[PDB]
Amino acid sequence: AVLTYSSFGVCADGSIIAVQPRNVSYDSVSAIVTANLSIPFNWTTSVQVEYLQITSTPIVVDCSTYVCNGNVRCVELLKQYTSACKTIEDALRNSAML
């Protein structure tokens, strides 16, 4: 399968197929007993890759220019929305700085 969702996958030519869980070998805690035990003897090295996002490009907007497009008299209607711009513009500013 190249694309998967839930138990359904599709291979290259487009055939749908059910997916099997990946086979692994669980480790076992070696017991203290007079018996025959198996111990790792012959070792090989492998490299496994993992990606983690640590930042997101922050964006700040001016609540006045976006809404009123710089119109002079529109500003004196938006200012009656007293708590609107501060909520939008502090929520973006503080997240970027932190």
Binding site: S28, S30, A31, I32, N36, L37
Partner: protein, 49 residues
Amino acid sequence: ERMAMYTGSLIGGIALGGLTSAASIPFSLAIQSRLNYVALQTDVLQENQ
């Protein structure tokens, strides 16, 4: 289906003891091995099980 095969595999792993041919030890020794990992056991007559 997959969950019953997932939790089922995890449950049965406790019976594994690293033996030859993966023959399962009696489960008292799986507990005893896990007690040794806390402190080195000296009760050899094994009354506390």
